[PDB]
Symmetry: D2
Subunit: 318 residues, 4 copies
């Protein structure tokens, strides 16, 4: 096949209509405004192409076959890589002054909101809480279909080692944390009645409340309904299982996936931050995977993590 | 206007035809191959949009009005900025393994050459040496004045070159010949040590290079041989801007010359990356060389002719 | 000279002391925490080296000689270039997990604040509102900031003089006459819903455009801290924006553009620092706000006062 | 601990000695020349810290315990991440003109070669084929096992190579010989097509060359290949069965080694460009075999299938 014909450059390179040129006097910098946003759209199509393929692997039960975890992780990594380039793409619009923008602003009258249909589909398909005709069919499908947050949440609940009958990760974790905090209180109370001792008693009482808050299923159920948390309590246990036992072969690639989901999340946030900066330059943590950020910030000592029995060691291996 | 309608996303987001899907079994990674090269093409259209606008400012005599130098420099800077992003865009294809590429390679059979019409137009329009409707644009790119040619014409008009006036080349040759003579006297005075012969050899090598600058005949030979592109009078004008860059009238032209070299090595880095990508998946001469050359003539600061108060106000 | 001796690599490559290793068990990832922050410090030293040299060109009156504007602009550009790399440097710490960080936090107990002396000196020297270090920290607050030195230079902008050109007078006359002519065009339209939306949008934009000429409102915000540049420096900055094409204002426009880049790059670095702190531990102040403000007054091109041939030759090299 | 004391900023921020300032007239831009190369050195120390830790995991037999593969892959990724930043660091020196460089070049007289001890140790420790105290570390780097050597030893232990069980090389040779024969039959059926007959004969020679142990043994001795023939079989096993859980992280490692390799080459390319910019690279890559094995264009269906006994094992 011929390069231009394979890429359909007859459509791609014939979609640049300068509204200034069309409505009278052509403003040169307006071409940049078209090309930059068209390039963002090409990349949003690729991000959606990868996101939907990953979403489908989970939905159609393929993610159960652990062989597919290489494909799942690599595609999510490609999404973060594409998002890193889109964040760098703001440097192109930075070459157009706010003064030069004003010379063509009246020909298109740009709103400051996120007018991209693809970006709204991307936000909905990942799991963002938060006028289009025919496009409202795709937008309704994005809200109705299972989000990546939902599909990951369902998969996280199936994490091995959670079963109370076998291994019982949450039970052993609560036992080691309660016994570890009690052993730390004994070490702190042993010290002299100095001001440095009372600063440690107050800091220990604050950290003890935080550590034990992890086990309050009712507090989590309250935050879930309040919107302050998105993952189910059983999915929190499964995500923490993967974090604490990431070295175990069966949990190595799932850990890369969880790391990748947090990267995509903060990359989406950096892109939105840059969009807002650009809007104000020219005119003047509600993250999908907050639970993953939360579980990684519970400062639990390495030695308090329950040990792995030789029956569980051979089970969490390929 | 509406976002999707203004951007004509009905054409842009409906031009992705996977040859694997069309010819039977759809290969997922093939979509990346389409989108990456389509995005390169959108940026080549923008690069050409800027390059042609700058090329026209020179061709239509607007570059004579010095007020347009902000517009010329800023648009050339935007070209280097876009080129920096295109070099970074290779990281996207780096996320596709050579093994995964092979699974769709047979559906399109990719040649290793630079099959982009826009990139060939970009190369010809800057000044890189040399279907049916597309062949009209490809012929026009070779026939029309290149950016190298338009810059060369403008460089010949640089103030300060006139032999009656300041006579830059004459004073430069006089200070360099006298500076080299003064250095030879200092070097020959030393004892016959190994450190002295290292200085005699290094001086004789630098002397040959410094005086080579004034050999108009040698330059005329290299120009015809293709090893040099700028006319001898344009070399003098470019060096005038380099040596007197601090002077207000030469501040923005210096930024322009700096920018042309940036674009040059960025085009070369993009071509280098293209070759790396081709070998990664299959396995199988700079336009402004004179500007790079003039910036590496290692001429001492004090040998540069001083500026008279009449030339300083000018 | 010898490479390692010239660079003093005997100090540079012998300043990495892992507190985990020294206090018992060595944690591998802790070396990254040292190297990243040391590399930020090397770049802060270079940023300060450039910032102070530019600050001095203004303070010693060299910035008066327009020949020095290439040196001023290029060094400020180098600062933005270095800042772009420091923002990209967050990708290195991103390769260390919050879990691995916990394994060595406790050996150093890191505070979430901006504990860098060099970064505080950089903030103070640009114009952001102990012991031997306290001498440099006091000097940074006492000496003239880059905002102050640029403000003084902006007040000397040619074309502001009321006797000759009178930029602010002609600008107020064209904006007041342009808004009046626009009100006449808007009132002429039929009683449609699109007409009432334009009457409301015009009344809002008219209030904003005329606010530019309210010296009292600006003097109030200046004292409140909500604005930093003097009213005469605002006029000078707007003169450079509107007549940026004019040769004498080409490089000063690049400088003003560069100051805004550095400003939002400093803000992006601070934003990234906050993100990194919350990533590892868990849960506006723009020096040149006036320049951002003057660039977003959406004044039509034709309303800008025209340039007379006497002013054209004056603003030329 | 306190920020500046923890970082030992008393040494770090007091090691900038401008040779121009010390030898008389201080040149401002010379500070950038010091800081850029000092920052490269801080990162080379970190790259070596990671490279040696990974090198040790292989050397001390920890890489046998597959649990350590997350630590191995993530640290090798961190090396590529740091190398990406060092390639981007050339943009800082790009802000210093060749003309401004000349104003301080005489105070240090810079050579065009790679004068970094740390970079030479990095090259030797990966597997690339000053004096005194430094010569002890430089000798140790050549004598100790390289990353190429440690990876080569590990690759020879790849499961599935055993001729009794699975016999990967045997089944691969059988399917490739039968597949090429079936392709020859399809091609010879067409009329005298001639571009496909010539391209088939060339590709057939390349595909079968994979099984010529003698040709590989010759190239290995000649230096044109670095990995042992048994390590090539093991690397190809990981490539073809990358989807298999036990080969997922090893495939990431092999991909990462090639990324580090081409990033080292891009850094060297940029160093050469920078040297020529201020004054007047090729396929000699440590992991050439990994690049080679990834570009053998063997059809997906010719890859031997996986039996349920081998599927549960991997
Ligand atoms: Cl192509 C186009 C057409 C109509 C509006 C926009 N608005 C921009 C925002 C923006 C506004 C003023 C100056 C710079 C940028 C925009 C960008 C991205 C998204 Cl998702 N929505 C919106 C752009
Ligand atoms: Cl979209 C398309 C269609 C047909 C051929 C190519 N060839 C690529 C080169 C390339 C080849 C194999 C693997 C990676 C890259 C190409 C890229 C850019 C240019 Cl200007 N010409 C050519 C691409
Ligand atoms: Cl080298 C060192 C020593 C002691 C504290 C810090 N604090 C970091 C902030 C930070 C905290 C936890 C995890 C990641 C980052 C820091 C970085 C930059 C600055 Cl200016 N101040 C502070 C670092
Ligand atoms: Cl800090 C220092 C001291 C003495 C020599 C070099 N040479 C540079 C090369 C280079 C030469 C001229 C202009 C720009 C760069 C260099 C850089 C990196 C390495 Cl590994 N070796 C060498 C630098
Ligand atoms: C067989 C399985 N894929 C088990 C599973 C689910 N989530 C996981 C996370 C890490 C490791 C394994 C799992 C399944 O039940 O789908
Ligand atoms: C009036 C003029 N623009 C002079 C000119 C030509 N090349 C230059 C370079 C630097 C500064 C000025 C010039 C012209 O002759 O076009
Ligand atoms: C001679 C002068 N540089 C004039 C000056 C002041 N501000 C400016 C802004 C743009 C251009 C020139 C100026 C001076 O007064 O320092
Ligand atoms: C136990 C083992 N790590 C097996 C092994 C060697 N190379 C491999 C590559 C991929 C997967 C496993 C291996 C060893 O022999 O060291």
């Amino acid at each position: 096949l011929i390069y231009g014909n394979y890429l359909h450059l007859e459509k791609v390179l014939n979609a640049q209509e300068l509204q200034s040129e069309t409505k009278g006097n052509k403003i040169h910098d307006e071409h940049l405004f078209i090309i930059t946003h068209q390039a963002y759209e090409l990349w949003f199509k690729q991000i959606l192409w990868e996101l939907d393929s990953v979403r489908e692997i989970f939905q159609n039960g393929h993610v159960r076959d652990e062989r597919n975890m290489l494909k799942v992780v690599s595609r999510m990594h490609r999404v973060s890589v594409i998002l890193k380039l889109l964040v760098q793409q703001f440097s192109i619009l930075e070459t157009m002054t706010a003064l030069d923008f004003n010379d063509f602003r009246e020909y298109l009258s740009p709103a400051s909101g996120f007018q991209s249909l693809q970006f709204r589909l991307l936000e909905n398909k990942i799991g963002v809480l938060q006028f289009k005709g025919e496009e409202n069919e795709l937008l309704l499908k994005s809200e109705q279909e299972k989000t990546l947050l939902e599909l990951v949440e369902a998969w996280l609940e199936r994490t091995p080692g959670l079963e109370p009958h076998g291994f019982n990760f949450w039970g052993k974790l609560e036992k080691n944390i309660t016994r570890g905090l009690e052993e730390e209180f004994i070490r702190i109370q042993a010290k002299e009645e100095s001001e440095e001792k009372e600063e440690q008693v107050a800091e220990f009482q604050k950290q003890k409340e935080v550590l034990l808050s992890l086990f309050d299923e009712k507090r989590h159920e309250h935050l879930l309904s309040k919107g302050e948390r998105r993952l189910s309590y059983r999915a929190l246990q499964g995500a923490l299982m993967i974090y604490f036992y990431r070295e175990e072969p069966r949990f190595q690639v799932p850990f890369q996936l969880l790391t990748s989901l947090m990267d995509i999340d903060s990359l989406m946030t950096k892109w939105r931050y840059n969009h807002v900066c650009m809007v104000h330059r020219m005119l003047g943590r509600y993250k999908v995977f907050v639970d993953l950020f939360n579980l990684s910030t519970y400062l639990i000592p390495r030695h308090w993590i329950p040990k792995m029995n030789p029956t569980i060691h051979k089970f969490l291996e390929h």
